[PDB]
Design a protein around this ligand. Structure first.
Ligand SMILES: C[C@]12CC[C@@H]3c4ccc(O)cc4CC[C@H]3[C@@H]1CC[C@@H]2O
Lengths: 213, 206
């Protein structure tokens, strides 16, 4: 069985630039390779097959090359619809394995997150629960860390986080951080603080509130 | 144009069986394949079916519990379902100068009982103000969230749900001018098709 090693796993670039994605087979696949593009979970779309033949409707700025065990997809003068994930797929012998994929994202200027903190709602409090929510919206680059503090002390348990994919409109990222507590637990403390650590600042970017106010 | 349509979302329990159909507008012409994609993961080839010889070929990890059939409609049958089969399944074929993939079919395999979400308003403790809605404890995925029945679409993004003890939770963020809220009402609409549920939560200032 032949496996495909695709690289790089992640790539960042801007409209107008050129990028190259490569795939290497563990055994000769004699040009039996296809390249696919996938947008936010949707059905993958064929770009090139047989290593170098462009599929119908595929812009000529896309081109595949290689032979034996080494192949690559070249994309020059990137267009905004070119950002997403790419996968190579050999079909020389079963199993027709896929490469691990390459995530191509938009490169833009750094942006500090806009932080918003939200105390538990009265409805949830009445039901006995207390979720404190923190939004870290529209920042770039994607790497970021969140740290919660209750009465000045860091809290680590009860925290669940989620991250959006790059925004198709402003190319930024967003993150939500939720600290779930019981009503009693939540009312045993006063100050709740959400702190983000991002490259846009050597200091924490914070937002907090006092249960009393 | 050649179009492959797949059957709707599936919800099953560990150990059960599921059949996913793939119906082509036309059609035996060249053979087809099925592909699996686990949440947030890459594409994984399940196998392909030589529509000519009727002979199928499966990838190691799928032999035994996954079977291809054809009746024109193509089928993917999975028995002895495990939680790990939770993913989106695609059927695909090819011909001429291209390939044709179906829209995909999502499958969720879990012991969890379909449970509607509890929706909570997220209001502030500037010229702009960010509001939100917490959608907690629902199963299975997904839920659709809109603001003011879709009238409020700009400055909006809904975070992916996280799974906490068989149940999913997510939140949605919306940013509007302070001159709009609370003067004008802002409401999030949450729909959970699996339980045929629809909930509206007005964002009221503290
Ligand atoms: C469907 C694939 C891309 C499209 C390829 C194609 C595309 C056009 C055609 O006339 C024949 C073939 C044969 C192999 C196909 C490939 C098998 C693996 C890959 O996913």
């Amino acid at each position: 069985d032949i496996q495909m090693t695709q690289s790089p796993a992640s790539l960042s670039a801007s409209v107008g630039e050129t990028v190259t994605i490569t795939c290497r087979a563990s055994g000769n696949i004699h040009n039996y390779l296809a390249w696919y593009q996938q947008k936010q979970g949707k059905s993958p779309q064929l770009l090139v097959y047989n290593a170098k033949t462009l599929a119908d409707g595929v812009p000529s700025r896309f081109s595949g090359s290689g032979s034996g065990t080494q192949y690559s997809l070249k994309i020059n003068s990137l267009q905004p619809e070119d950002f997403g994930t790419y996968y190579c797929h050999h079909f020389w012998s079963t199993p027709w394995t896929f490469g691990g994929g390459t995530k191509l994202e938009v490169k833009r200027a750094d942006a500090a997150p806009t932080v918003s903190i939200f105390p538990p709602s009265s409805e949830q409090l009445t039901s006995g629960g207390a979720s404190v929510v923190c939004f870290l919206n529209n920042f770039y680059p994607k790497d970021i860390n969140v740290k919660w503090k209750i009465d000045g002390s860091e809290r680590q348990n009860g925290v669940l986080n989620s991250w959006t994919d790059q925004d198709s409109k402003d190319s930024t990222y967003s993150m939500s951080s939720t600290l779930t507590l019981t009503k009693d637990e939540y009312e045993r403390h006063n100050s709740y603080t959400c702190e983000a650590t991002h490259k846009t600042s050597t200091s924490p970017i914070v937002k907090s509130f006092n249960r009393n106010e | 144009q050649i179009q492959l349509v797949q059957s709707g979302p599936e919800l099953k329990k560990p150990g059960e069986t599921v059949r996913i159909s793939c119906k082509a507008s036309d059609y035996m012409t060249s053979g087809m394949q099925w592909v699996q994609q686990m949440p947030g993961k890459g594409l994984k080839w399940i196998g392909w079916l030589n529509t000519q010889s009727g002979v199928p070929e499966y990838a190691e990890d799928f032999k035994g519990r996954f079977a291809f059939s054809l009746e024109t409609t193509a089928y993917l049958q999975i028995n002895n379902l495990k939680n790990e089969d939770t993913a989106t399944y695609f059927c695909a074929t090819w011909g001429g100068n291209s390939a044709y993939w179906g829209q995909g079919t999502t499958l969720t395999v879990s012991s969890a009982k379909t449970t509607p979400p509890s929706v909570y308003p997220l209001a502030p403790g500037n010229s702009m103000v960010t509001l939100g809605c917490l959608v907690k404890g629902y199963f299975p995925e997904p839920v659709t969230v809109t603001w003011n029945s879709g009238s409020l679409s700009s400055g909006v993004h809904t975070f992916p749900a996280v799974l906490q003890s068989d149940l999913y939770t997510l939140s949605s963020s919306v940013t509007v001018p302070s001159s709009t809220w609370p003067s004008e009402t802002v409401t999030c609409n949450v729909a959970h098709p699996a339980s045929s549920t629809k909930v509206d939560k007005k964002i009221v200032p503290r």
